Amino acid sequence: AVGACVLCNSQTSLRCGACIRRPFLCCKCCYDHVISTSHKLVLSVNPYVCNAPGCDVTDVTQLYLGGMSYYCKSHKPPISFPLCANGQVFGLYKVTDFNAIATCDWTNAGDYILANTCTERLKLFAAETLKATEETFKLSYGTVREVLSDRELHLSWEVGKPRPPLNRNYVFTGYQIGEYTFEKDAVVYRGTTTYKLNVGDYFVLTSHTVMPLSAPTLVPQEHYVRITGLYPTLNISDEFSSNVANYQKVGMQKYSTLQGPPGTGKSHFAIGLALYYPSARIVYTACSHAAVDALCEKALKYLPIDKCSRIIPARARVECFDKFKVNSTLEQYVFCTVNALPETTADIVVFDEISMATNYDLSVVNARLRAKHYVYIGDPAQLPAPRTLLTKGTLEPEYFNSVCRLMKTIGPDMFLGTCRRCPAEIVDTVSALVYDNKLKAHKDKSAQCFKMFYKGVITHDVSSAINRPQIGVVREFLTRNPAWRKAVFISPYNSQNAVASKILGLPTQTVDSSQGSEYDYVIFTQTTETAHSCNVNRFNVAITRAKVGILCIMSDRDLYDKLQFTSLEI
Ligand SMILES: [Zn+2]
Ligand SMILES: [Zn+2]
Ligand SMILES: [Zn+2]
């Protein structure tokens, strides 16, 4: 029960029993915390409480030290001194920001802003407090009535508690018969495992214990004068020649940031780093299984298949890359999600899709992976990890995580400025929208990029929006543009996606789940004109999925006018 103060590192024996993480606080800092918040319980070898029989006084400001025990004003002996005096709480070895992180409920965007602009140690405490606050709430949200078929169900809920939204962010566990997701009387049930399940089975949200954090989100930066710990090859392929200047900067710094807009070659950069440093052992990590899978696919073409291994938790979350040797931690090239990372060492660590990472994830990576060099690849102009507790305000990219903050304040170390995937109409649009006209297009205009302003009629299934007339507009477009039936339908709402799947028969994806993918033809309906559907990062992701053509049914005049597409009438 002896440690370092979370604000001043000054050693102390006092903890705050009211904070959910019970951090160590120094005599001065613990004082400033109890007099400015409702947190009044102080812990030590023994709890600072009145030891008189039947007394419930726990406020440290109402407690004194008499003998070797603690008492209140009504039980203290004549010879006693106050625990709280001289700007200090009594302990061994005898701020405004810390109070806010410790007492907020993480429902306002200002809470996440403070968690990214504070000192480095407060970032660790905030990430701990946030994840702990997120987990407790899970134990509280609100049974199959009848099985109709092999993919839909009728559900009945528990009495007295609200219903959690039915999407992919909320994964239920049925009863360890596997993890399930639901989507919206009829509801679609999708269990990762095909276990049998009759009427009466109940499902509960899967909770994962929050472990305390110790490693920082970012290691201390170190700049070198020569390539350290690595041996660069001289005969690099001409496919990776343009990255040699930035490849050398990787070996001369502890960490490096790379902002890669869509289609600029992020995975091409990451895989070629292994060819430029052929003797290095590399762990490729990311938050999602799809991001690590994309890095596996690029590796299969360029890296020896016998030196690659994909780490899969027996948790069998989803089907992952099955073309590398499974669960071989000691291989040269290791592909693994952050949550499943083993405790090992590496020459370089590549963290992909950095905008989807939380400050918790940055800490787990540093705690499990000791490496000579870390490279963070991503794009703060794309989508972040969902903060389910955040309901008031929008989280700006500078407050996504420590890495995204640096990319937006001082800029990224390296930048990929040429998009090779999208037609010029899409590139010019997003370049002016979120990239300061610094993103150039390798392709010409395709003349297959169209936009249409059509508000339609907005209906809602609970909280997910639907715009059937916008789908009807798409229907009429398909009958007149037959080559587009191979397109992918994208929208910001799962429900609009479910309706479009039945009416149009196209493959469907949400904008958030389409990040990292690319398709020849994309059809996008904005559905609504909300802050969710008008988010510039979401929109940037949505329209940069197309390789050849895109059709945008717009609800927002601003974003409609900013689209440099040909307008179609109907
Ligand atoms: Zn506290
Ligand atoms: Zn302190
Ligand atoms: Zn008492």
Q: What is the 3-state secondary structure (H, E, C) of 341-379?
A: CCCEEEEEEEECCHHHCCHHHHHHHHHHEEEEEEEEEEC
**Two structure tokens written together for 448:** 């297959």
Distance of alpha carbon 338 from alpha carbon 324, whole angstroms: 18
Say how many Å lie between the CA of residue 364 and the centre of ligand 2: 25
Maximum pairwise Cα distance, the chain: 94
Collapsing DSSP to helix, strand or coil, 191 comes out as strand
- What is the phi/psi pair of residue 389, to 5°? -80, -15
Rounded CA separation 78/288 (Å): 63
- Ligand 2 center to 26 CA (angstroms): 4
Q: How far is the CA of 445 from the centre of ligand 2 (A)?
A: 60
This structure was determined by X-ray
Ligand nearest to the CA of 29: 2
Cβ pair 118, 68 in contact under 8 A: no
Where do the DSSP E strands lie in 338-491? Answer: 344-351, 369-378, 414-415, 418-419, 440-441, 449-453, 458-461, 464-467, 488-491
The topology (CATH level 3) of 424-567 is Rossmann fold (3.40.50)
Ramachandran class of 67: left when φ > 0, alpha when ψ lies in -120 to 50, beta otherwise:
left
Annotated binding site for a ribonucleoside 5'-triphosphate: which residue ranges?
260-267
Tokens standing for residue 214: 């110790």
**Cα–Cα dist 500/525, whole Å:** 10
Question: Cα(2) to centroid of ligand 1, in Å?
Answer: 17
DSSP strand E in 445-525: where? 449-453, 458-461, 464-467, 488-491, 508-510, 519-525
**Residues 55, 72 contacting (CB under 8 angstroms):** yes
In the numeric block, which tokens belong to residue 253? 């710094």
Q: For the chain, what's the residue count?
A: 570
Q: Which residues of 84-109 are buried (b: 16+ CB within 10 A; e: fewer)?
A: beeebbbbeeeeeebebbbbbebeeb
How far apart CA 229 and CA 469 sit, in angstroms, is: 60
What distance in angstroms lies between residue 212's CA and the mean position of ligand 1's atoms? Answer: 16
Strand partners, 3: 12
Q: What letter represents residue 321's amino acid?
A: F
Whole-number Å distance between alpha carbons of 534 and 530: 6
The Cα angle at residue 76 between residues 71 and 79, in degrees rounded to 5:
125
Which tokens belong to 67?
Answer: 């003998």
Q: Residue 100 corresponds to which amino acid?
A: A
Is the CB of residue 44 less than 8 Å from the CB of residue 2?
A: no
Residues lying with their CB under 5 A of ligand 1, a single-atom ion:
16, 18-19, 39, 102
Contacts (Cβ under 8 Å, ≥6 apart) of 400: 116, 355, 357, 380, 384, 385
Pair 129, 210: CB distance under 8 Å: no
Question: Can you tell me the distance from the alpha carbon of 141 to that of 108, in angstroms, rounded to the nearest whole number?
Answer: 20
CB 559 within 8 Å of CB 434: no
- How far from each other are the two terminal CA atoms of the chain, in whole angstroms? 72
Burial class of residue 530 (count of CB atoms within 10 Å of its CB; 0-12, 13-18, 19+): middle
How many helices (H) and strands (E) the chain has is answered by 16, 33
Whether the Cβ atoms of residue 177 and residue 197 lie closer than 8 Å to each other: yes
Residue 254 and residue 429: Cα distance in Å, rounded? 35
Q: How far apart are CA 56 and CA 72, in angstroms?
A: 10
SS3 566: strand
The identity of residue 21, as a single letter, is: R
Three-state DSSP class for residue 508: strand
- Here the tokens at position 296 are 């596996």
Among 284, 302, 301, 300, smallest CA distance to 377 is for 284
Buried b (16+ CB within 10 A) or exposed e, 20-58: ebebbbbbbbbbbbbeebebbbbbbeeebbbbeeeeebb
